[PDB]
Design a protein around this nucleic acid. Structure first.
Lengths: 244, 244
DNA sequence: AAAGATATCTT
DNA sequence: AAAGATATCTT
């Protein structure tokens, strides 16, 4: 299927290629920096060709946003099936050591999930799937990156800002947690777990319907949350009480 | 001076080189996307070797943040004078057609300017200068060709996501404005003007001390600013009356 | 944890 | 404009 083909293509491409710099039209190469600010950008760009190739192979049109603060990174759909759109978002995070627990920010909880057309390319109801392509990289111990330029002959001598990279594709609701991923920017937080758990989808919500109800009624501050719910257990008790 | 040389080098490099993609150690090239999240990263990386080259020529050490989310992008200082550090931050914004008005977000107003060691590499009082290297690019619409990978022999064929790029170097206080650049993320806003005004330094503050005082006492919401000041005129009247 | 940093945009 | 979106991190 589209999903299985995309997952195979992602593993393969990632296992074969290692990004090491930005290149100019004149052939001069500039090395990469250490921060996720740099790496999330690199992984977004690395993924575009893969996604588009697999999508074409299945008769899916691929669209990127026009406005810069609009979700998702990629909207896939067949012209004949306008209400069966697939949303793909690329998310990045790091680990200092290979077997540590990681977590992702999974998007705002006050935008499109509460208002059908807010900050989203197409109305939220036109999407039948929301996939997360997550990249996890291990930072290198050296805090000092290279500050000189290179040429094509020196590609093998350019130091990489990451030690290793792992990728996965998974439905957003399956990996969503019950604690916010950010405060002032009100993001949904993912489960705090090992890479394997994201791959296998060991989440906390019983369904996508529960995931949505939880995040649509989550309060912004703990003060407001204390009289409602602060976690999954409390949310379920809140349902029992009659949503009050 | 360090400053004249740095801007001559940036201006020169920008005219002779055009970034067109990221490259893998295997020689595969991936095209660039058209949003600022992407170009901001590219311009940061493009600037690094130039800043380091010019700094070394003048005997300065160049240091990048050891921790993420710490200002500034580059800290320059002579070993013999640790308390006269220079902060350089790279900022990017876009324009839809050349010669329109632009504005930048100039960093937070509730972190290091109010608390000497908050989110900054070295205590704020050890910096004698805060320079902003600003990049302005004219946005260009993404085409189908940008969604495939390329080879080294095709560098000149890869489409660029920008039509033109202008660069300037100026002191932060000089180009700082009196209105916030963001709400929930409390950023200082720059003057809203044409590129030449940034190069020339036609700002609104009379001194760096006025700039600091204004932003150290700027309230976070218009409700709270109502009885204090919302702009430079009201701030000056407020100062005239005894800060009441 | 929760709250508020990092950079920049949109209406 | 002011306020709150986009992604992610740290204390």
């Amino acid at each position: 299927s589209l999903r299985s083909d995309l997952i195979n293509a992602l593993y393969d491409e990632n296992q074969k290629y290692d990004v090491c710099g930005i290149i100019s039209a004149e052939g001069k190469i500039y090395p990469l920096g250490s921060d996720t600010k740099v790496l999330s950008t690199i992984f977004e760009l690395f993924s575009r060709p893969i996604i588009n190739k697999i999508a074409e192979k299945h008769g899916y049109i691929v669209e990127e946003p026009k406005q810069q603060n609009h979700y998702p990174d990629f909207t896939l759909y067949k012209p004949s099936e306008p209400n069966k759109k697939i949303a793909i978002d690329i998310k990045t995070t790091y680990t200092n050591k290979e077997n540590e627990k990681i977590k992702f920010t999974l998007g705002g909880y006050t935008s499109f999930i509460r208002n059908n057309t807010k900050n989203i390319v197409y109305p939220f109801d036109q999407y039948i799937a929301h996939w997360i392509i997550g990249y996890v990289y291990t930072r290198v111990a050296t805090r000092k990156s290279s500050l000189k330029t290179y040429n094509i002959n020196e590609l093998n001598e350019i130091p990489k800002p990451y030690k290793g990279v792992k990728v996965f594709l998974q439905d957003k609701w399956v990996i969503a947690g019950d604690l916010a991923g950010s405060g002032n920017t009100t993001n949904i937080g993912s489960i705090h777990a090992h890479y394997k758990d994201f791959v296998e989808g060991k989440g906390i919500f019983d369904s996508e319907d529960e995931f949505l109800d939880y995040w649509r009624n989550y309060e912004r501050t703990s003060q407001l949350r204390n009289d409602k719910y602060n976690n999954i257990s409390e949310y379920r008790n809140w349902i029992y009480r009659g949503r009050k």
